[PDB]
Amino acid sequence: RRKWNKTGHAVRAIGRLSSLENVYIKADKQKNGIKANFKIRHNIEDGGVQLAYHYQQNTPIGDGPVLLPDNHYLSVQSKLSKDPNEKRDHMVLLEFVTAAGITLSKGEELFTGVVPILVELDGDVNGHKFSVSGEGEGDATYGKLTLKFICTTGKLPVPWPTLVTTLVQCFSRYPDHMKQHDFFKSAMPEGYIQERTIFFKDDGNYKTRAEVKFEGDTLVNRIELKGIDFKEDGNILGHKLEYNTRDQLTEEQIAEFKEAFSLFDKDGDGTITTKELGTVMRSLGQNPTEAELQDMINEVDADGDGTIDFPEFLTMMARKMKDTDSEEEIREAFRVFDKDGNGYISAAELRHVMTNLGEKLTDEEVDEMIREADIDGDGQVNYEEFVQMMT
Ligand SMILES: [Ca+2]
Ligand SMILES: [Ca+2]
Ligand SMILES: [Ca+2]
Ligand SMILES: [Ca+2]
Numbered sequence: 001r002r003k004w005n006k007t008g009h010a011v012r013a014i015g016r017l018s019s020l021e022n023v024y025i026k027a028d029k030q031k032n033g034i035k036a037n038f039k040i041r042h043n044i045e046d047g048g049v050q051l052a053y054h055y056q057q058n059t060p061i062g063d064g065p066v067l068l069p070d071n072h073y074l075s076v077q078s079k080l081s082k083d084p085n086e087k088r089d090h091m092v093l094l095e096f097v098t099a100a101g102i103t104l105s106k107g108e109e110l111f112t113g114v115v116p117i118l119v120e121l122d123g124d125v126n127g128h129k130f131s132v133s134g135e136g137e138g139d140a141t142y143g144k145l146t147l148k149f150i151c152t153t154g155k156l157p158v159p160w161p162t163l164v165t166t167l168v169q170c171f172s173r174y175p176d177h178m179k180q181h182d183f184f185k186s187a188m189p190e191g192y193i194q195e196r197t198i199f200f201k202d203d204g205n206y207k208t209r210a211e212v213k214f215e216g217d218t219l220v221n222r223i224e225l226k227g228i229d230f231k232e233d234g235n236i237l238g239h240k241l242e243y244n245t246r247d248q249l250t251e252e253q254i255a256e257f258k259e260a261f262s263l264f265d266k267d268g269d270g271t272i273t274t275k276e277l278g279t280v281m282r283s284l285g286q287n288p289t290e291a292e293l294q295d296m297i298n299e300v301d302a303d304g305d306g307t308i309d310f311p312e313f314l315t316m317m318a319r320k321m322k323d324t325d326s327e328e329e330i331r332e333a334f335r336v337f338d339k340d341g342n343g344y345i346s347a348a349e350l351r352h353v354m355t356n357l358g359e360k361l362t363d364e365e366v367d368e369m370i371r372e373a374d375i376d377g378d379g380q381v382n383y384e385e386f387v388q389m390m391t
Contacts, residue, residue: 001372004389007357009260009317011333012390014281016320017296017308019329022073022101023169025183029068033059033192034183038073041323042161042235043242049324050235051201054165058183061213062190069181072101074172075302077319078164079245089151091160093136097143097172104177104304107188111140111170116218117147119167125227126204126237128157134167138219140185143173158227159241166196166208168221177304189214204230246322257317261310263357272297272308283356284336334386345370345381 023038036056041049060066074097081092119134136147149160149167156163170184184192191213198206210223230237264272264280274293281288288296297308300316308316325333337345337353351366361369373381373389381389 001368004369004373005256006259006263007353007359008390009256010263010280010357011284011336012320013260013264013313013317014284014286015325015329015333016316017277017299020299021319021323022075022299024071024073024101025069025181026071027068027183028057028059031057031059032066032068033057034069040165042159043246043324044235045240045242047324049326050203050241051326052162052165053199053201054196055198056194056196058187058192058194060187060190060192061211062187064187064190067105067180067183067186069183070102072099072178072181074099074169079247080161080164080243081245082243083148086148086150089154089156091149091164093134093145093147093149093164093167095145095147097145097169098302099172099174099178099181100302100304101298102178102181102304103298103301103306105179105182105186107185108179108182110188110214111138111185113141114139115171117145117168117171117221118215118218119147119149119221119223121163121167121223121225123225123227125158125206125225126230126232128237129153130157132156132163132167138168138171140171140173143171145171158236159239160243161241162200162206162236163225165198166206166210166223166225168212168219169194170212170219175304188219200230200234200236203234203236204228249318253321254314257314258310260317261313265310270310272313274306277308280357283358284353285339285356330387330390331383333390334383337381337386343382345386347379350381 023036025034025036028035038054040052044050077096079094083090083092115138117136117138121132123130131152132149133152134147134149138145170188174182194210194212196208204227206225206227208223208225210221212221235241264276266276278288278293300308300312302312335341337349339349347366347370350369354361370381373385375385
């Protein structure tokens, strides 16, 4: 009955494969560097997302030859926590970062063991000034960082999660077949300039400039930050963003993802191919190209084999649940059922979905599905009811 989940999760899975959530890197030959772009989703404490669109560029500080990558991405897992004995405004951060996106150097040497890190930031957002110091270490063998940041000026005037991207991609793990694409370590020890502009949707933007390089045996990130046009009661200056990661692999949740996974893996081999992804998408009335199938897959394909295997699927859904979708995204999902776009999923509409999905349900079982979802009782599922169902 609560079999909204399987179908909900499959639609949600296609949504993930359809989005662009990683950190995309491209060569910037004119600068002998790289450029990057990506999106960050910040949960709003009471529901919703604050999106932050990043544009990035990096040039080497030295003249030594450096590595210019083919296009690829980094994939980041962050967990933010608090130190229970710390009385200052602070953030504990634990991060894992792995390169992927390409299918199957001398500075790299400096990163084979544990390397100490110092971070220093001065900022100014809407005239509100502040500093942050951070210290910890980096273990590139595993793409790992552990760091503790302190707001050295008192209360931080923006939420800590908005600073995470600004506060050392040289610590990411490149897999063996991609080592030639690691611009970040190749620029070391003398390092690189990293610049960004970061747009918070419906709000202000940050401009950052940082110098990242070895000082002694320590990897140091020194940063200036300027934010303008922030709304005094927006999510940023109003402090309306969640701090807590919310990282809850709830095991009955894993079992829910397995169920969705099986809708796609119809031969039961524990991997999803383009054939299989295509089949599910046509059933739902899309018509992706062979190339789009390869790109969708490549977006979550950690090993580069061209397929989404089961662990890669759990990792992707994990992230899809930790982050909040935008209205546009929840609407697009809704439309997968709302075939005529009137605002209402009718009994007939849900039938057409479930039937085309190969799901063997009766006009009686379909009726039960509506009832489970139909709060207001009109015999249909409207937008809000859909949202409640999907939570
Ligand atoms: Ca399969
Ligand atoms: Ca794979
Ligand atoms: Ca409809
Ligand atoms: Ca209703």
